[PDB]
Write a protein that binds this ligand. Structure first.
Ligand code: CLA
Ligand code: CLA
Ligand code: CLA
Ligand code: CLA
Ligand code: CLA
Ligand code: CLA
Ligand code: KC2
Ligand SMILES: CC1=C(C#C/C(C)=C/C=C/C(C)=C/C=C/C=C(C)/C=C/C=C(\C)C#CC2=C(C)C[C@@H](O)CC2(C)C)C(C)(C)C[C@H](O)C1
Ligand SMILES: CC1=C(C#C/C(C)=C/C=C/C(C)=C/C=C/C=C(C)/C=C/C=C(\C)C#CC2=C(C)C[C@@H](O)CC2(C)C)C(C)(C)C[C@H](O)C1
Ligand SMILES: CC1=C(C#C\C(C)=C/C=C/C(C)=C/C=C/C=C(C)/C=C/C=C(\C)C#CC2=C(C)C[C@@H](O)CC2(C)C)C(C)(C)C[C@H](O)C1
Ligand SMILES: CC1=C(C#C/C(C)=C/C=C/C(C)=C/C=C/C=C(C)/C=C/C=C(C)/C=C/C2=C(C)CCCC2(C)C)C(C)(C)C[C@H](O)C1
Ligand code: SF4
Lengths: 174, 42, 175, 178, 60, 154, 74, 172, 161
């Protein structure tokens, strides 16, 4: 009846072990306040956006698309944001992500009703998880990599705020 | 507080005097801090 | 199948109407009558099919009575005002007579009339039922396609200031 | 038989530990002369306004809306410098929130006429964070403790802004004795 | 009218005309005014009861 | 018999209502708990409210950047107000109310954006600590802790 | 000053009208004396009973209103 | 039974759903004191007058009669620029219109708003009649609110609604 | 301006009134030594007189030929703060006061002995009532429309006609 991750603390009652990545880690009792379905949807959304942002920071350090260097110049990481607000790219990005997030809102409220798993958009066009066990293995890997990429992208953007190098440039220059 | 003393304090002349002094103190302090209000200022 | 697999199928969309793939994520059919929604969808689509054809034809062909603008959207602003009012009131007469002077959601379908069927089928075309179903499906898909297409053609002609086929060649980019 | 907060006074009647934050602290006998439902509703309202007010007095120094009219770090200057029509809109909106949120029962004779109406229970739970039973009493205790601390803190900040003519955080950083 | 009932007075000259009293006793003998009615408001003479006929009292 | 501030109208001799509805437990995201008609929380519950807020936030994005954008010869864009959009056929009213009439950002000098904070309407953040420390400061920084320390050390 | 003295004149006219109209309309009877019409237009009183009935007739209302008429013309 | 406009209040007793513009809205209880059919007739007349007024505060900005082409587009100036003769003719015509309303309201027992003006017979269809009956009261209330707005905005700005909008004169 | 009156901020006789008041206070000030408490009190009176005349001159008040501010009370909004808006403030308070008094009367009828409640006020109940008066127009109008304010004529005592 005790938390596995923090052995001197009780097992949270909203945690059960069914969800991928459940090690009984909720010491401050956030699952006692919010719904666990809302919390899992928020965790998956933060993690997926952070994986995309981490991979984006790495690849934009590595290379650039044709023509972006003329419009942007020698501006990198969050420094491009304002420039790409003056250009039309991020308005298009926000428009289509808002269009997707309208149906995301409907899906989240459907999950809060209780007919749909949090973060289950049934988007598997390559049919990777045929048998359920590999599905469990990808679920655990997805939640672990999402949390890891949350921490990683936080470190990357705050290291950019400190030195203005970039996640690979800071590695390549102390 | 003795209940009979409170009931005496709740009589019409005592409460009348206290309320009218309280109202007069409102008018006096309002005219002390905001004097010469012939009009509502625009 | 369902257009959105992560939500359940909308209960008021039973698949009887042509074009129903189960796409109502907001749930408009849960609040409003589906006959009104079908009449509105077909009218918007038909107006857009005529608008797409007009935007493609007014770019190249101009009657000598009028004087063409540089783009088919500017073509609206060079017409005499009385002619635009004539077109508007003729369309109003058509809207009054085709609906039996029953123009509101409370009385349009009071006599059990079919949504989108205004009885305008002059040139035969409506005796085979198996062809009627397929032409219903084609009409609703081309109507939605012409809605999205008309939106695109009007907004890009407003932006670039040239016509559609004038923009397919000599194509410039925002800079 | 004695009050727990004030051990030399007898326990005030109608106070039996049922409400949150009840330590038997009523030396002047307000609960012996007025009903506890109105007193609790008033205490929660003053406390919630002071929670928002203390958070505003701290936040407005660090964060401002754009514009010249919202650039006053000291809150008593921001009361005057803000556009007047906006503050009159704020007054009217607070009046409407009072009018509908209490369901047209606004006075000392008609609020709590419905037996289901609970002190401080306006029905306000936008994200439904109260859907858990054993958290509830601790939640009301935390809410009233935050409200009481915010009342005392906001009183102290307003009168210290009056003494010092300084916004609170930079008054703590640029302190000048009286 | 009966014992205990609340009645309105229709006697024009009465102090309690169109006011409400309580019936205290109905006399059964051949009295011109057998209905004793007691009032909560005192008159100018300080009395609070009076005798009325059957037609001068209407049940409310 | 009648406690002060009890709020019962029968206790004060006030005209009562009699009809007191039971309080349901159903909750709406941007609404209020209370008695409603049958069918109300099922059509206009949390799902509807969140969907309409999402749709309003989506439709805000073209509305915030409202204007006639026109391409020039060099491919650049010139944004000009809808107030100059003229119509041929409403008499002497060439200028007409537009979408910018309902949302007049430029009238107030408000640089609107699709997330409603703009470049010229940015939220202003400034550090109130003035770049000094909590204690042991020599300069223009005399904190409360420094005042305490000087009060003990005198 | 003209404003104030015309509103004072209005006060005096309304008050004299109050006395005279109240005397005329209560001449037939009141709650203190419902049979006043049996006693005529002028009589001294109805005795010290019922609280006291000094100056209860309509002639007495004339007598009181004469002072207010003198005040108004003054 | 509770009111449907205000779901925490009881339903008002003297308004029922058979009245065309019913929504269960009487928080001040006007229907509990006054004659409900009179209040219906008065609401219908105020709304009809405001429908004509809301159209006529806007319409001279689009175009004017050729004899009134020199008249101002501000309604509060064009009210005065009309001479006493034209306003007297308008008042006489309104009186001719109100003679029928006087007879119907003070001596008849017709439906509220029924002055017998239905030349096109658009209320012959039952569902259409119900929709028009509700829609008249809805657009009448909307025009009351709108005409109130236009009049006080024209007091503040001394110009018509379209003119005030296109100049964006929104601050006093 | 209105009724041939001039604004007080440009009236020369308003300035003459101000100058006469200032000289009348200054001739009293002349007989006291600087720093004495009567001198400070007189200088404070001078400051209040100057501030009052300055405030009155910048308020849009109209002055007659006498030199005093004249109030306009025909309903025009350009002097709406001179009679209309203060009167409504009274209308706020007075309609409050009677209503709470009326409420107490309706309470007092329900007690065991009403007259003891009339001479000895139930202070918590009275404080509840005086709290209730902030929404008095809507409450009074709802009391009126529900038939609880006006009583019919057949339940009120009247004299023989
Ligand atoms: C009964 C059949 C009929 C008749 C006799 C007319 C007659 C006319 N139409 Mg026309 N029209 C009709 C049916 C008819 N229309 C229908 C059914 C449609 C829709 C398919 C149109 C669409 C249409 C357009 C798009 C235009 C006309 C125009 C004209 C005018 C051409 C001459 C001109 O410009 O000088 C007159 C010049 C003026 C400046 C005078 C102002 C125009 C007057 C007031 C219009 C009077 C029309 C009349 C009432 C009949 C209208 C019928 C109605 C059902 C549409 C002429 C008055 C043209 C026009 O008015 O150009 C200005 C024009 O651009 N019409
Ligand atoms: C929002 C990002 C962005 C921006 C601002 C631009 C901007 C530009 N691109 Mg570009 N491009 C992009 C994304 C972008 N592109 C992407 C995702 C691809 C797909 C790989 C391309 C592929 C591309 C090609 C193939 C070419 C451009 C070219 C150009 C330039 C036109 C002159 C212009 C500066 C042209 C050029 O001259 O650039 C060198 C050109 O030939 N772009
Ligand atoms: C660490 C990466 C990772 C992993 C293991 C998963 C795993 C999973 N996702 Mg997922 N996802 C991810 C990242 C990841 N996701 C990101 C970044 C997004 C945002 C675009 C999503 C968006 C997403 C949606 C919308 C849905 C899933 C679903 C699923 C499940 C179905 C199986 C599947 O398609 O996975 C296969 C995944 C892989 C084989 C990972 C390969 C990684 C590539 C090769 C790296 C490319 C890097 C590139 C340079 C950038 C499974 C648990 C579905 C679900 O839960 O319901 C069935 C579903 O509906 N995911
Ligand atoms: C007691 C509450 C209260 C009051 C009266 C004010 C008053 C003011 N604030 Mg303010 N503020 C508050 C709380 C409050 N604040 C809180 C809690 C925050 C932190 C989010 C802020 C953050 C803030 C900023 C960043 C700025 C102001 C500013 C201002 C001034 C201009 C008005 C304006 O634009 O509002 C702006 C108001 C907000 C940005 C947030 C207000 C949120 C409130 C608390 C509403 C939430 C509760 C609401 C009533 C819903 C509950 C309903 C329920 C009870 C049924 C004005 C003096 C501006 C100013 O002059 O700068 C100095 C400015 O730039 N405020
Ligand atoms: C003795 C009769 C008399 C009466 C009863 C009124 C009554 C009124 N006058 Mg007025 N006036 C009078 C004589 C009179 N006046 C004379 C003799 C003059 C010439 C000196 C004026 C010159 C005058 C002007 C110049 C103005 C008024 C205005 C007003 C109105 C303002 C009250 C208000 O807020 O309502 C309005 C508010 C509501 C009805 C509801 C709001 C809640 C009011 C109806 C003002 C007005 O608005 O005109 C109509 C105005 O500007 N009056
Ligand atoms: C509860 C308070 C109350 C109320 C609501 C009324 C209501 C009325 N009075 Mg009345 N009156 C009262 C007390 C009250 N009276 C008292 C105490 C006196 C003795 C001085 C009078 C003497 C009086 C006269 C002589 C006249 C009226 C008239 C009127 C009517 C017109 C309003 C008016 O002229 O007010 C003016 C009110 C006064 C001049 C006296 C008010 C005295 C104080 C301010 C009110 C008492 C407040 C009370 C102490 C609050 C305690 C409650 C608290 C415990 C919660 C109206 C029916 C007039 C009438 O017939 O018009 C049709 C009229 O001629 N009244
Ligand atoms: C085309 C029509 C339409 C639109 C575009 C629209 C948009 C939005 C938005 C957009 C940002 C929000 C945020 C929002 C929110 C709420 N709406 Mg919704 N709404 C529409 C229709 C109706 C109707 C007919 C009703 C209704 C209601 C509520 C309630 C209930 C609160 C409660 O029940 O406590 C809440 C919170 C019901 C109600 O009570 O309204 C007083 C009701 O009857 N709505 N609504
Ligand atoms: C599922 C869906 C599709 C999908 C697609 C998706 C997009 C597939 C891709 C999923 C991708 C985006 C996974 C990315 C994970 C990021 C990792 C965890 C993090 C590194 C951050 C840490 C280590 C760090 C940092 C560190 C610090 C902080 C700062 C630096 O100085 C140094 C350093 C860099 C070391 C596919 C096609 C697969 C098919 C499927 O049918 C349907
Ligand atoms: C109900 C719930 C809602 C939630 C909500 C609300 C918004 C909750 C968030 C609330 C905020 C407003 C709580 C504010 C506390 C303010 C006080 C404690 C600060 C006191 C500092 C004082 C004591 C000290 C002071 C000191 C003073 C004296 C002297 C100075 O020199 C220094 C200093 C400043 C240090 C949500 C929206 C989530 C939905 C959900 O479904 C239901
Ligand atoms: C009787 C009937 C028929 C009839 C027909 C007749 C002619 C009936 C005509 C009915 C007509 C008059 C209806 C007009 C409605 C206009 C109202 C709704 C609007 C006000 C606008 C408001 C919302 C606003 C505005 C706002 C203002 C405040 C401020 C601005 O900043 C913004 C904005 C502009 C938005 C006939 C005769 C054929 C016979 C038939 O047998 C029966
Ligand atoms: C775009 C843009 C901008 C921006 C921006 C962006 C992109 C901002 C991104 C911010 C992010 C991603 C922050 C992440 C913070 C993570 C933290 C604090 C983790 C702490 C972990 C802890 C304490 C412990 C972890 C742990 C450890 C060690 C091990 C055990 C587990 C646990 C206890 C959990 C701006 C603002 C510059 C403006 C610009 O004009 C436009
Ligand atoms: S004192 Fe009065 S009651 Fe007595 S005799 Fe004289 S007038 Fe009559």
């Amino acid at each position: 009846a005790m938390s596995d991750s923090v052995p001197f603390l009780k097992q949270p009652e909203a945690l059960d072990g069914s969800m991928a990545g459940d090690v009984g880690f909720d010491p401050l009792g956030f699952s006692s306040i919010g719904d666990i379905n809302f919390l899992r949807e928020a965790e998956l959304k933060h993690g997926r956006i952070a994986m995309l942002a981490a991979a984006g920071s790495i690849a934009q350090d590595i290379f650039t698309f044709p023509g972006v260097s003329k419009v942007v110049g020698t501006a990198k990481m969050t420094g491009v944001h304002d420039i790409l607000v003056k250009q039309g790219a991020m308005g298009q990005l926000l428009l289509w992500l808002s269009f997707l997030e309208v149906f995301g809102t409907i899906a989240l409220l459907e999950t809060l009703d209780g007919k749909r798993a949090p973060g289950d958009f049934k988007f598997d066009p390559l049919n990777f998880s045929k048998n359920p066990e590999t599905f469990k293995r990808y679920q655990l890997a997805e939640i672990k990599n999402g949390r890891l990429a949350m921490m990683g992208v936080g470190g990357m953007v705050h290291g950019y705020f400190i030195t203005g190098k970039g996640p690979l440039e800071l590695l390549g220059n102390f | 507080m003795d209940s009979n003393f409170l009931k005496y304090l709740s009589t019409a002349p005592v409460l009348f005097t206290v309320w009218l002094s309280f109202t007069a103190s409102f008018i006096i302090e309002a005219n002390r801090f905001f004097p010469d209000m012939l009009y509502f200022p625009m | 199948d369902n257009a959105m697999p992560f939500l359940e199928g909308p209960p008021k969309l039973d698949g009887s109407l042509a074009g129903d793939v189960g796409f109502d994520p907001v749930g408009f059919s849960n609040y409003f009558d589906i006959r009104w929604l079908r009449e509105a969808e077909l009218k918007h689509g038909r107006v857009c099919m005529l608008g797409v054809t007009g935007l493609l034809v007014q770019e190249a062909i101009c009657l000598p009575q009028f004087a063409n603008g540089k783009t088919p959207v500017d073509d609206f602003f060079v017409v005499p005002a009385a002619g635009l009012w004539q077109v508007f009131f003729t369309i109003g007469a058509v809207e009054f007579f085709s609906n039996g002077f029953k123009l509101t959601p409370g009385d349009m379908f009071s006599e059990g009339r079919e949504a989108g069927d205004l009885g305008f089928d002059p040139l035969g075309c409506g005796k085979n039922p198996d062809a009627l179903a397929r032409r219903r499906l084609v009409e609703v898909k081309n109507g939605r396609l012409a809605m999205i297409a008309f939106g695109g053609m009007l907004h890009q002609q407003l932006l670039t200031g040239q016509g559609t086929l004038e923009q397919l060649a000599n194509f410039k980019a925002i800079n | 038989a004695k009050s727990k907060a004030v051990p030399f006074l007898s326990q005030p009647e109608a106070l039996d530990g049922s409400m949150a934050g009840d330590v038997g602290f009523d030396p002047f006998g307000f609960s012996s002369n007025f009903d506890l439902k109105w007193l609790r509703e008033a205490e929660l309202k003053h406390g919630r306004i002071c929670m928002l007010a203390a958070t505003g007095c701290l936040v407005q120094e660090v964060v401002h809306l754009p514009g010249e009219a919202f650039s006053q770090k000291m809150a008593l200057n921001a009361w005057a410098a803000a556009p007047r029509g906006g503050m009159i809109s704020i007054l009217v909106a607070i009046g409407l929130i009072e009018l509908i949120s209490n369901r047209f029962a606004l006075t000392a004779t008609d609020m709590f006429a419905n037996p289901n109406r609970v002190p401080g229970d306006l029905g306000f739970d936008p994200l439904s964070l109260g859907g858990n039973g054993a958290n509830r009493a601790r939640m009301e205790l935390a809410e009233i403790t935050h409200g009481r601390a915010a009342m005392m803190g906001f009183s102290g900040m307003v009168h210290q802004m009056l003494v010092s003519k300084q916004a609170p955080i930079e008054q703590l950083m640029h302190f000048k004795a009286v | 009218v009966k014992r205990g009932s609340k009645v309105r007075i229709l006697r024009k000259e009465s102090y309690w005309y169109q006011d409400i009293g309580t019936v205290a006793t109905i006399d059964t003998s051949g009295i011109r005014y057998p209905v004793v009615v007691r009032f909560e408001k005192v008159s100018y003479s300080g009395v609070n009861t009076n005798n009325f006929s059957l037609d001068e009292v209407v049940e409310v | 018999a009648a406690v002060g501030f009890s709020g019962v109208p029968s206790q004060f001799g006030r005209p009562e209502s009699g009809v007191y509805p039971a309080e349901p437990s159903e909750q709406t995201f941007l609404g209020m708990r209370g008695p409603r008609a049958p069918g109300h929380r099922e059509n206009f519950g949390g799902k509807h409210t969140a969907t309409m807020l999402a749709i309003a936030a989506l439709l805000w994005q073209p509305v915030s950047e409202a204007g006639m954008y026109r391409m020039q010869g060099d491919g650049s864009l010139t944004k000009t107000s809808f107030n100059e959009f003229e119509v041929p056929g409403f008499g002497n009213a060439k200028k007409v109310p537009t979408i910018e009439s309902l949302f007049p950002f430029s009238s107030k000098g408000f640089d609107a954006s699709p997330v409603l904070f703009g470049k010229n309407s940015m939220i202003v953040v400034e550090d109130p600590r003035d770049g000094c420390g909590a204690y042991a400061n020599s300069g223009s920084c005399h904190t409360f802790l420094d005042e305490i320390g000087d009060a003990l050390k005198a | 000053g003209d404003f104030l003295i015309h509103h004072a004149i209005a006060l005096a006219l309304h008050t004299t009208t109050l006395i005279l109209v109240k005397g005329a309309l209560d001449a037939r009877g009141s709650k203190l004396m419902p049979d006043k019409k049996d006693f005529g237009y002028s009589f001294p009183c109805d005795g010290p009973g019922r609280g006291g009935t000094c100056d209860i007739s309509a002639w007495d209302a004339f007598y009181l209103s004469m002072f207010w008429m003198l005040n108004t013309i003054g | 039974e509770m009111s449907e406009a205000i779901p925490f209040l009881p339903k008002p007793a003297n308004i029922d759903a058979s009245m065309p513009g019913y929504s269960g809205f009487d928080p001040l209880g006007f229907s509990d004191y006054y004659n409900v059919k009179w209040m219906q007739e008065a609401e219908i007349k105020h709304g009809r007058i405001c429908m004509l007024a809301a159209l006529g505060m806007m319409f001279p900005e689009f175009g004017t009669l050729p004899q009134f082409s020199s008249f101002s587009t501000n309604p509060l100036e064009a009210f005065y620029q009309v001479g006493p003769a034209g306003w007297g003719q308008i008042l006489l015509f309104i009186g001719v219109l109100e003679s029928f309303s006087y007879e119907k309201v003070f001596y008849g027992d017709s439906a509220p708003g029924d002055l017998g003006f239905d030349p096109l017979r658009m209320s012959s269809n039952a569902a259409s009649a119900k929709h028009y009956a509700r829609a008249e009261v809805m657009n009448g209330r909307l025009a009351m609110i709108g005409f109130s707005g236009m009049l006080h905005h024209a007091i503040l700005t001394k110009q018509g609604p379209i003119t005030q909008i296109v100049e964006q004169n929104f601050v006093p | 301006d209105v009724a041939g009156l001039t604004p007080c901020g440009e009236s020369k006789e308003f300035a003459r009134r101000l100058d006469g008041s200032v000289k009348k206070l200054q001739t009293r000030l002349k007989k006291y030594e600087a720093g004495t408490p009567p001198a400070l009190a007189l200088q404070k009176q001078i400051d209040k007189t100057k501030n009052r005349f300055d405030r009155y001159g910048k308020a849009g008040l109209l002055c007659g030929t006498d030199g005093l501010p004249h109030l306009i009370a025909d309903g025009r909004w350009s002097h709406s703060g001179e009679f209309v808006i203060p009167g409504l403030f009274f209308l706020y308070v007075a309609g409050w006061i009677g209503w709470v008094g009326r409420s107490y009367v309706l309470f007092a009828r329900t007690a065991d002995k009403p007259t003891e409640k009339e001479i000895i006020i139930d202070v918590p109940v009275a404080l509840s009532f005086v709290s209730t008066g902030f929404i008095w127009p809507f409450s009074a109008f709802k009391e009126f429309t529900s038939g609880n304010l006006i009583v019919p004529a057949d339940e009120i005592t009247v004299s023989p006609r």
